[PDB]
């Protein structure tokens, strides 16, 4: 019996129920509500009632841990929401708020249902309020499998992570017809809101998958990292890997020349456990890396610069990416580990015309507000305000480390030499820049002041990180009483 799904598969596409079956465990899905009708009675809609009413909501179970989910249905009315569709979603989110369980939704709606009038707006508003209230209480993940247009786009935005499917998905606020009507330009749906556009240009989508099957397979892996609720502790899984594994290849990663580049992944991979990195937003703002990883069987958060791309310089997009990652990680009590290599901020008129001052402050706010244990490692250099922003010791950092060839200075040697000698005799470059770099572009001064705990061999990083992260397991820090902060938007 394979009835009524032949029409769907013929278009090389899967069904909502099949997606739900693929996500959860083999036999642990219990559909909650299945016999519900729209009761519209307008515009010749009194007929063609549907039992499911276009939504599939259940409970399920992943890796032995509970979950909640819902999936849109494209065959029935195009997946449009109504006064009645939104009730099921509201009930699921409320139940997942009472119990410490997350929510995952597979969006496929074609837009609002016009035949209901303003009831669709009512349902949208209720879903928006539930998302707003419960953000930071239970993790929310959203996946977009098909078209997603109109005002329905906003609820995925408030969710913590949004993923996209490559061939047959798109998302935008207004359709290309209106764009043609007002501006006069003919742009296709994919050219407007395709997965690539949101992966590279707008920065909304947190990832892209080639197929639905791969999407489910990796969504399970992502779910294996998250904590169940706000009050539950960070999960710890058994692992045969051990902190005594030898990592001596880190002694040679940093080149002896100051103008040559290297890949920061060569430093990230040895420290964490084998094959346990899940990069977030891999194709957007490549000069910074963010993602999840495990250290001795417990999930941690990774944020590191990359001198491979644009000399590892902070920017607007990198600031937004890092700020969102830090805020989410702190909201759910996940340790943060950072690797620092920054020469400063990206210079340019477009930057000031785009508001670098606002955006660069977001990362600093996220780092200063955080109360989870932090570990910082300075590999090569840290200059100016970039050193302050990237989790400096003064921002209530727990432990800070440096490598023997690091440099921590106010600015580059040339600018310091220029400002320290206004009209000093010519040729001052040769006998002053070298001396200043020798005397003050070294971690000795910063260690004398007390800004780094110790200068360590690069081969001891795994040992030190495991020791510190084990000791810091029970830190309790609290901020002054506030209704909420006022972050620079």
């Amino acid at each position: 019996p394979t009835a009524a799904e032949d029409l769907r598969h013929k278009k090389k596409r899967l069904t909502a129920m099949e997606r739900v079956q693929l996500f959860c465990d083999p036999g642990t899905f219990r559909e909650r509500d299945a016999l519900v009708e729209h009761e519209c009675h307008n515009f010749g809609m009194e007929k063609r009632k549907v039992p499911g009413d276009g939504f599939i909501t259940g409970t399920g179970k992943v890796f032995g841990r509970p979950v909640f989910l819902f999936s849109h249905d494209f065959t029935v009315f195009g997946g449009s929401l109504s006064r009645t569709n939104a009730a099921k979603v509201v009930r699921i989110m409320e139940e997942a708020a009472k119990i410490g369980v997350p929510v995952i939704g597979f969006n496929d709606s074609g837009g609002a249902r016009i035949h209901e009038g303003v009831d669709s707006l009512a349902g949208y508003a209720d879903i928006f309020l539930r998302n707003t209230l419960f953000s930071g209480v239970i993790p929310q993940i959203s996946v977009i499998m098909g078209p997603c247009a109109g005002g329905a786009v906003y609820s995925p935005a408030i969710t913590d992570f949004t993923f996209m499917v490559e061939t047959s998905s798109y998302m935008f606020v207004t359709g290309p017809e209106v764009v043609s009507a007002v501006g006069g330009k003919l742009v296709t749906k994919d050219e407007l809101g395709g997965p690539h556009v949101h992966a590279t240009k707008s920065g909304v989508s947190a990832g892209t998958f080639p197929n639905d099957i791969v999407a489910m397979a990796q969504l399970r892996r992502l779910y294996s990292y998250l904590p169940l609720s706000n009050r539950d502790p960070v999960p710890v899984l058994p692992t045969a890997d051990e902190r005594y594994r030898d990592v001596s290849s880190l002694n040679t990663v940093v080149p002896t020349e100051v103008k040559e580049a290297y890949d920061m992944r060569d430093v990230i991979y040895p420290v964490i456990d084998h094959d346990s990195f899940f990069e977030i937003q891999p194709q957007f703002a490549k000069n910074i890396i963010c993602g999840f990883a495990r250290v001795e069987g417990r999930s941690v958060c990774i944020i590191a610069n990359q001198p491979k791309v644009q000399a590892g310089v902070l920017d607007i997009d990198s600031s937004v990416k890092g700020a969102r990652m830090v805020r989410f990680a702190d909201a759910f009590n996940i340790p943060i580990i950072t690797f620092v290599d920054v020469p400063g901020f990206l210079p340019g008129v477009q930057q000031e015309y785009g508001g670098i001052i606002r955006h660069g402050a977001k990362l600093l706010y996220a780092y200063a507000e955080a109360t989870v244990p932090k570990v910082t490692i300075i590999t090569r250099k840290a200059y100016g305000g970039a050193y302050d922003v990237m989790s400096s010791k003064h921002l209530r950092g727990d432990s800070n480390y440096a490598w023997p060839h690091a440099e921590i200075a106010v600015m580059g040697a040339a600018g310091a030499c220029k400002l320290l000698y206004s009209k000093e005799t010519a040729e001052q470059q040769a006998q002053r820049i070298a001396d200043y770099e020798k005397t003050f572009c070294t971690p000795l001064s910063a260690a004398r002041k007390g800004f780094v705990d110790a200068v360590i061999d690069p081969s001891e990083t795994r040992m030190r990180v495991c020791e510190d992260l084990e000791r810091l397991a029970r830190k309790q820090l609290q901020n002054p009483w506030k209704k909420h902060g006022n972050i620079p938007l």
């Binding site: 890796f63 032995g64 841990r65 294996s224 899984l237 058994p238 692992t239």
Partner: protein, 131 residues
């Protein structure tokens, strides 16, 4: 030779390419094990570029079985406490077009022992994998 054969496969090299495939193929060739060779041996046996020899049916079957065992072992790691499975039915097929769908079972009777078979209600062999 057998020693070399075995010792070639245990050399883990990561970060750059190498020619271990050529050495393996040359050693495994029955012409090399015949007893005598020549100095024009290489280009005589490699006329157009280089093309590694393929796998026989039993070798590919064994690779399938080991892949299924590894998949189950790594799957059981992620589950919490005793809420973990012990038997599945997998469908292995190499290639982008699923060439040769081979149903496989697995039982995981101990930490490093399985009961691989064709499917359910099929005779089992009880191989061993240590990884």
């Amino acid at each position: 030779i057998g020693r070399m054969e075995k010792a070639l496969d245990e050399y883990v090299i990561r970060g750059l390419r190498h020619n271990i495939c050529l050495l393996r193929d040359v050693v495994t060739e029955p012409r090399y094990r015949s007893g005598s060779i020549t100095t024009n041996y290489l280009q005589e046996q490699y006329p157009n570029g280089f093309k590694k020899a393929e796998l026989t049916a039993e070798e590919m079957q064994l690779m399938y079985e080991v892949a299924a065992c590894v998949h189950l072992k790594r799957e059981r790691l992620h589950y919490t406490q005793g809420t973990a499975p012990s038997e599945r039915q997998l469908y292995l097929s190499v290639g982008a077009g699923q060439e040769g769908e081979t149903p496989v079972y697995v039982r995981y009777l101990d930490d490093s022992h399985f009961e691989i078979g064709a499917s359910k209600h099929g005779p089992f062999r009880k191989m061993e994998v240590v990884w």
